[PDB]
RNA sequence: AGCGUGUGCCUACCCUACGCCGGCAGGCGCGGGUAACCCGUUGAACCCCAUUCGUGAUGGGGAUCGGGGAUUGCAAUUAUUCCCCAUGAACGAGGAAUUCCCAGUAAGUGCGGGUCAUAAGCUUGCGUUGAUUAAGUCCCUGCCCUUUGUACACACCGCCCGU
RNA sequence: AGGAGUGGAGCCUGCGGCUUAAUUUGACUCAACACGGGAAACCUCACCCGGCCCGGACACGGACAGGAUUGACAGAUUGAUA
């Protein structure tokens, strides 16, 4: 119907040109995170992902102290 | 706070000194002992310089820094 | 107009402040008159600071 | 030479490009009305010029 | 096994195209980096990668290259081809993959060494 | 420093035709407010004038970002022992006394 | 060619300032007191309160020639 | 709602009013305003509300962090650049120590100037919602108008006694 | 016996503690510490892995149509069409 396509969750990824159906929980949330070539690809991103920090930089020595309690 | 401490490379330097021979030797030469001769170096068929612009010789690339010119068959 | 800037020329003591200010009063009269009334009523040896602005519009 | 070094890459925010007219000054500059002084040296003219302390 | 493919679309063919509609199955990320347009010092680091391409043998490492180019990609067709950019004290190289459109030659460097932390004493310690 | 002879001849007759002059410190910016379009550089120009007004025997006075000069009878006899040119050809600026 | 109003009169002050700082740094010796700008039609009128005035004139008005001079060859002024 | 700002001595840098159209700043044409004339009766904002909480981990206020075209600033990542899928974070008055504050205080909240390239988490101002407690005291920290003591006067961080 | 908002729950900076190119001038309680209106790529970085175009109104020295100036991609430079 051509309504507006801005509406699914994971969009304009890799290995597909359309945004394809999945379901059931312990799947979407790992999805959440695409950490599969970010890692291959040897980068930063794959370690500022993983240990829970920041990947954009948010400052973390007085403020921004959330995210492990 | 320190010193820059540049001082782990280049000591001390000399300046350069081009040994620009007072003598013309190798820049020009006759090759004929007579009132007409030969010159040495390809006519310039440029018409954006001069009627004397006479062009230095390298391995390639004749480099006078006003034209760059590079003789190119296209 | 305002400008507002510390009064110390280095940084140090209180942070203290000028609060500098300029005023610009504009008042604008209209009568119908030719040029030569306008030119002769300005030439009255007039007091400082009053900039006079004529427009034929 | 010069041509092929100078004006390649626009510079279009040169702190150095201004200057106290007074003092020529490169910090605490007021480009404010036109100004273009230092600080220090508005305080010093500020009277002067018409501004004047009243609040 | 068949190789990888990108975005579900090959490169070659898209390569043989011009730029009209070669962003409708990219990604962001050098989404208009590729739109801001060329300037000049930009292909030194494509010939350079041509010259170390053209130099080596196939199916062999080539030499190490020394720059420090913070610049943009429009072409994947260097797919098997490597940067090496100057970082900190040492030299550092990524593996490459046609996932070129998405990420930049800048995001692979970890200046964030970690804290090597002290034991603080003779002053405030409590 | 690092001015060839002919601006200094320039520079030299500039100072001969103006005698009473004002002017700013610019060096290395490319246009200038007051004193360009001479057909001479204006960074050689400027430090020929710094030359003039600094060499050491013509006092100068540095303030509100601007110069205003006093051209002592001394640089005129260092011009005139120089050059040769006698004060008979008197500068047209004694009109409108 | 046009600035706005506050322009116009800032730029206004910034001329009397350093006009009065000038003539405060060349004849501070002369017995100068003050500098008074008046507007007149077309015309920029400056008056000088000194308590002496033989030596700003001096002789011939030399003084005054070539400190009018240099002011007008500074500010901007017509020929 | 402001308070205010907005385009040549220098100077090359101003504030902004329709369409390409995915859903609007916006990559390009376009006019106005040296300004109570245009932005603008201040152009991606109240705090409100037929998306609502029946007794509090739900709809209620966001732990990262991914896409849609990015204002166009070489670089930004080794400081510039939007809201949406509801992916669930001690999810409801806080070691020792404490800083500011008495009515349009505090606090919430945005906006404008300065810096500047419309660069703010800073500062300087401005409105908007709106205020529990107190009209007291010298207890702590200090200050002042007295009397008193002093072996202090570098003035109690003083002076000074003891193998 | 008052309180409200606190530095701890949502937009990083100042300077010392604090590995080599990283903790870089002035400011040692109130009267230092988004303070020098100081929002550090760079013109303002001196902690900085790196350089070049360099200064003398004079005191004394080396001596004239040559005693060098930012000013070439491809054999490179230590990022750099230096």
């Keep these: ?69 | ?74 | ?57 | 030479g010069h041509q092929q070094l100078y004006w390649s890459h626009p510079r279009k925010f040169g702190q150095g490009s201004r200057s106290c007219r007074v003092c020529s000054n490169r910090h605490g500059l007021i480009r404010k009305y036109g100004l273009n002084m230092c600080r220090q040296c508005f305080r010093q003219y500020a009277k002067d010029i018409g501004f004047i302390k009243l609040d | ?126 | ?97 | ?79």
Excluded at chain 1, 16 to 23: A, E, F, T
Excluded at chain 2, 1 to 20: L, V
Excluded at chain 5, 1 to 26: H, I
Excluded at chain 6, 13 to 22: D, H, I, N, P, T
Aim: glycine share 6%.
């Design chain 1, 1 to 69: 119907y051509k309504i507006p396509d801005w509406f699914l969750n994971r969009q304009k990824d890799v290995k597909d040109g359309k945004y394809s159906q999945v379901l059931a929980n312990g799947l979407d949330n790992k999805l959440r995170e695409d950490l599969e070539r970010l890692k291959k690809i040897r980068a930063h991103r794959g370690l500022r992902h993983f240990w829970g920090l920041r990947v954009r930089g948010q400052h973390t020595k007085t403020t921004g102290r959330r995210g492990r309690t």
């Design chain 2, 1 to 74: 706070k320190k010193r820059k401490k540049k001082s782990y490379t280049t000591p001390k330097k000399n300046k350069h000194k081009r040994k620009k021979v007072k003598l013309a030797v190798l820049k020009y030469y006759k090759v004929d002992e007579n009132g007409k001769i030969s010159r040495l170096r390809r006519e310039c068929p440029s018409d954006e310089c001069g009627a004397g612009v006479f062009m230095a010789s390298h391995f390639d690339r004749h480099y006078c820094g006003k034209c760059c010119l590079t003789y190119c068959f296209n």
């Design chain 3, 1 to 57: 107009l305002r400008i507002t800037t510390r009064k110390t020329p280095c940084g140090e003591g209180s942070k203290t402040w000028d609060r500098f200010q300029m005023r610009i009063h504009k008042r604008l009269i209209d009568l119908h008159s030719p040029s030569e009334i306008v030119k002769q009523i300005t030439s009255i040896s007039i007091e400082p600071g009053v900039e006079v602005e004529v427009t034929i519009a």
């Design chain 6, 1 to 97: 420093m690092l001015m060839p002879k002919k601006n200094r001849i320039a520079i030299y007759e500039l100072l001969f035709k103006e005698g009473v002059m004002v002017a700013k410190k610019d060096v290395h910016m490319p246009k200038h407010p007051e004193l360009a379009d001479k057909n001479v550089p204006n960074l050689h120009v400027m430090k020929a004038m710094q030359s003039l007004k600094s060499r050491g025997y013509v006092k100068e006075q540095f303030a509100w970002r601007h110069f205003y000069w006093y051209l002592t009878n001394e640089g005129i006899q260092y011009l005139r022992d120089y050059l040769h040119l006698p004060p008979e050809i008197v500068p047209a600026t004694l009109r409108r006394s």
């Design chain 7, 1 to 79: 060619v046009q600035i706005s109003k506050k322009r116009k009169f800032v730029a206004d002050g910034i001329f009397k300032a350093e006009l009065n700082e000038f003539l405060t740094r060349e004849l501070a010796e002369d017995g100068y007191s003050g500098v008074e700008v008046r507007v007149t039609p077309t015309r920029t009128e400056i008056i000088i309160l000194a308590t002496r005035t033989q030596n700003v004139l001096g002789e011939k008005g030399r003084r005054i020639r070539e400190l009018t001079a240099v002011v007008q060859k500074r500010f901007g002024f017509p020929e």
């Design chain 5, 1 to 126: 096994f068949r190789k990888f493919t990108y975005r579900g679309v090959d490169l070659d063919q898209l390569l043989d195209m011009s730029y009209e509609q070669l962003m409708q199955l990219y990604s962001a990320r050098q989404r208009r980096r590729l739109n801001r347009g060329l300037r000049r010092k930009q292909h030194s680091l494509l010939k350079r990668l041509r010259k170390a391409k053209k130099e080596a043998p196939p199916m062999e490492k080539p030499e190490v290259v020394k720059t420090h180019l913070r610049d943009m990609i429009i072409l994947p067709e260097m797919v098997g081809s490597m940067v090496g950019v100057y970082n900190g004290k040492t030299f550092n190289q990524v593996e490459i993959k046609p996932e070129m459109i998405g990420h930049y030659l800048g995001e692979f460097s970890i200046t964030y060494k970690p804290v090597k932390h002290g034991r603080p004493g003779i002053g405030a310690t409590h």
